[PDB]
Write a protein that holds these residues in place. Structure first.
Motif, short mmCIF file in Angstrom:
data_model
loop_
_atom_site.label_atom_id
_atom_site.label_comp_id
_atom_site.label_asym_id
_atom_site.label_seq_id
_atom_site.Cartn_x
_atom_site.Cartn_y
_atom_site.Cartn_z
N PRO A 160 0.78 -1.23 0.00
CA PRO A 160 0.00 0.00 0.00
C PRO A 160 0.81 1.28 0.00
CG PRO A 160 -0.91 -1.66 1.52
CD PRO A 160 0.37 -2.19 1.06
N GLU A 161 1.98 1.27 0.64
CA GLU A 161 2.80 2.47 0.69
C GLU A 161 3.29 2.87 -0.67
OE1 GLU A 161 2.86 -0.28 2.84
OE2 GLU A 161 3.08 0.65 4.83
N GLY A 162 3.26 1.93 -1.60
CA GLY A 162 3.62 2.27 -2.98
C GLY A 162 2.76 3.36 -3.61
N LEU A 163 1.50 3.44 -3.18
CA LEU A 163 0.55 4.39 -3.75
C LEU A 163 0.88 5.78 -3.20
CD1 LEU A 163 -1.85 5.19 -5.51
CD2 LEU A 163 -3.32 4.40 -3.64
N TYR A 164 1.28 5.85 -1.92
CA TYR A 164 1.72 7.10 -1.34
C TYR A 164 2.94 7.66 -2.08
CZ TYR A 164 3.89 10.30 1.99
OH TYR A 164 4.52 11.36 2.59
N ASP A 165 3.93 6.76 -2.26
CA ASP A 165 5.23 7.14 -2.86
C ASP A 165 5.05 7.58 -4.29
OD1 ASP A 165 6.80 6.84 -0.48
OD2 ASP A 165 7.26 4.78 -0.97
N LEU A 166 4.14 6.93 -5.01
CA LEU A 166 3.84 7.33 -6.33
C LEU A 166 3.17 8.69 -6.36
CD1 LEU A 166 3.65 6.70 -9.37
CD2 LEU A 166 1.71 5.29 -8.96
N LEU B 84 4.53 12.19 -8.23
CA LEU B 84 3.73 12.98 -9.18
C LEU B 84 3.68 14.44 -8.75
CD1 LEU B 84 0.91 10.37 -10.12
CD2 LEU B 84 2.47 11.36 -11.72
N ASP B 85 3.34 14.64 -7.49
CA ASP B 85 3.26 15.96 -6.94
C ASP B 85 4.64 16.70 -6.99
OD1 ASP B 85 1.75 18.01 -5.20
OD2 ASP B 85 3.49 17.54 -3.89
N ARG B 86 5.72 16.03 -6.71
CA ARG B 86 7.06 16.69 -6.63
C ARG B 86 7.64 16.99 -7.99
NH1 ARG B 86 9.23 12.52 -4.34
NH2 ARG B 86 10.46 11.87 -6.19
N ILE C 257 -2.83 13.03 0.54
CA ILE C 257 -3.66 14.22 0.59
C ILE C 257 -3.19 15.09 1.80
CG2 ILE C 257 -5.97 15.08 1.11
CD1 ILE C 257 -7.06 12.89 -0.65
N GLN C 258 -2.97 14.45 2.95
CA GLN C 258 -2.59 15.22 4.15
C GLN C 258 -1.23 15.85 3.98
OE1 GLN C 258 -5.86 13.84 4.50
NE2 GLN C 258 -5.36 15.50 5.97
N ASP C 259 -0.39 15.23 3.14
CA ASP C 259 0.92 15.70 2.79
C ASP C 259 0.99 16.70 1.59
OD1 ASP C 259 1.78 14.44 5.03
OD2 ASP C 259 2.84 12.77 4.07
#
Length: 449
Positions: free
Chosen positions: A331-337, A341-343, A389-391
């Motif tokens: 699941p953490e893969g989705l955060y890292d991705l 994208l954002d960065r 989102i929180q990040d």
């Protein structure tokens, strides 16, 4: 803790026309490359086809009632190009337009926002007889199809995707030959990649020129490619693997260049492709959001004597739990991705256009499908989306793949991703525990974790 999404967060579910509709030869529809591929023995697991599939072409009213019961606020679907132009270009098939105008109007009447993919793999076979996506002209036929659709639906549909996973259509359809149209040639796959992206740009330009009052993007297949360690050679390997996969499409779309590391590899392999200088300027037309389909992550090692220079880190992969697809659950893969994208791309608006999982379903004694592993997957992945989102990531919408069990391409009916079970013999629908869980998620705008 209580995970609550933004107030205006869009909760959706997704399908694709070939995977659900059936009616493969009804109401003037032309043959698609997937009709042809499915009919050819050895290409689909168990000799299954999309001839009938879920029969959504006839059962859409029931499906919309199910969507209303779950309370999805948007439905992502695709339009079949050969229902609209049976020969790809030429005579418009009004009955095709008519089906999708009815569907769209019914979604809206039931308070469900339509979100339309123009191209989800069903190229008209007559176009493939002329060379398919290797033929630059196909990019114009696509723009002409897109024009008719925008004329008929543009200002009642708020969200548009030009393409779904061009990198899969190229790689599986034209290098590996395991998807329609079953071609196996690296140079052809790279010409196809380019023409797919070109056709995206043409459609976006057209969309702006016709002043459609809606938003438009593209749905790419994306995963985070983790290096196998913190060594620069592993970091560089993983970066290259990503540049030959999702970033081969992201960089053209969002930066107007192909990645330099991947271009060097292809040159090293003796492919130096040259396209008009203006093609990249057209490919990188501004879009309203970047969308992606994500399920899993990659782990990559340095592998200098290989043809690629990198390979999967199997010792790392073998340790994870997997889905029924054999894909790692991480699941953490989705955060890292999402944070990448954002960065890397100037904090774009982001849509997850597919996420979900296949597990083996069983109907119990109680008549119910208690798909606990699918719920756990969805909850763990949505927890990571929320953390993004929180990040500060501008994630706007999540489309759960899929509303319905469906035809899973080369796997046929063997792999069930639905939140609603379909018996493919009787066509009966039954909402799984995951569907009623999603109902709860939507009503609570999240969940506890």
């Amino acid at each position: 803790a209580k995970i609550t999404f933004p107030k205006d967060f869009i909760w959706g579910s997704a399908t694709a026309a070939y995977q659900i509709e059936g009616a493969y030869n009804e109401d003037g529809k032309g043959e698609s490359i997937w009709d042809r591929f499915s009919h050819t023995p050895g290409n689909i697991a168990d000799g299954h086809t999309g001839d009938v599939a879920c029969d959504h072409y006839h059962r859409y009213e029931e499906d919309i009632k199910i969507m209303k019961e779950i309370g999805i606020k948007s439905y992502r679907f695709s339009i079949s190009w050969p229902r609209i132009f049976p020969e790809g270009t030429g005579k418009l098939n009004q009955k095709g337009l008519d089906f999708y105008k009815r569907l769209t109007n019914l979604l809206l009447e039931n308070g469900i926002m339509p979100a339309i993919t123009l191209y989800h793999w069903d190229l008209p076979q007559k176009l493939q007889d002329k060379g398919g996506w290797k033929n630059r002209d196909t990019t114009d036929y696509f723009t002409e199809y897109s024009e008719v659709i925008f004329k008929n639906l543009g200002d009642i549909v708020p969200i548009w995707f030009t393409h779904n996973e061009p990198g899969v259509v190229s790689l599986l359809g034209h290098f590996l030959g395991i998807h329609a149209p079953g071609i196996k040639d690296l140079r052809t796959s790279l010409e196809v990649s380019h023409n797919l992206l070109l056709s995206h740009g043409k459609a976006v330009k057209l969309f702006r020129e016709m002043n459609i009052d809606a938003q438009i993007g593209i749905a790419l297949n994306l995963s985070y490619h983790y290096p196998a360690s913190e060594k620069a050679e592993d970091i560089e390997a993983a970066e290259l693997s990503f540049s030959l996969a999702g970033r081969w499409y992201l960089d053209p779309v969002l930066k107007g260049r192909y990645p330099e590391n991947a271009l060097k590899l292809y040159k090293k392999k003796g492919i130096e492709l040259s396209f008009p200088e203006d093609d990249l300027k057209l490919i990188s037309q501004p879009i309203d959001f970047i969308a992606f389909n994500n399920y899993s992550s990659e782990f990559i090692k340095y592998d200098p004597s290989s043809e690629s220079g990198f390979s999967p880190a199997n010792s790392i992969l073998e340790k994870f739990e997997k889905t029924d697809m054999g894909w790692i659950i991480y699941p953490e893969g989705l955060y890292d991705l999402l944070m990448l994208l954002d960065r890397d791309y100037g904090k774009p608006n982001i849509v997850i256009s597919e996420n979900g999982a296949a597990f083996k379903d069983e109907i119990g004694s109680n008549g119910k499908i208690e798909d606990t592993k699918r719920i756990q997957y969805l909850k763990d992945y949505l927890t990571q989306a929320h953390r993004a989102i929180q990040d500060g990531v501008n994630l706007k919408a999540y489309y759960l793949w899929s509303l319905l069990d469906n035809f899973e391409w080369a796997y046929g009916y063997n792999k069930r991703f639905g939140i609603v079970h379909v018996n493919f013999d009787t066509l009966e629908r039954k909402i799984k525990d995951s569907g009623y869980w999603y109902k709860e998620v939507i009503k609570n705008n999240g969940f506890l974790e």
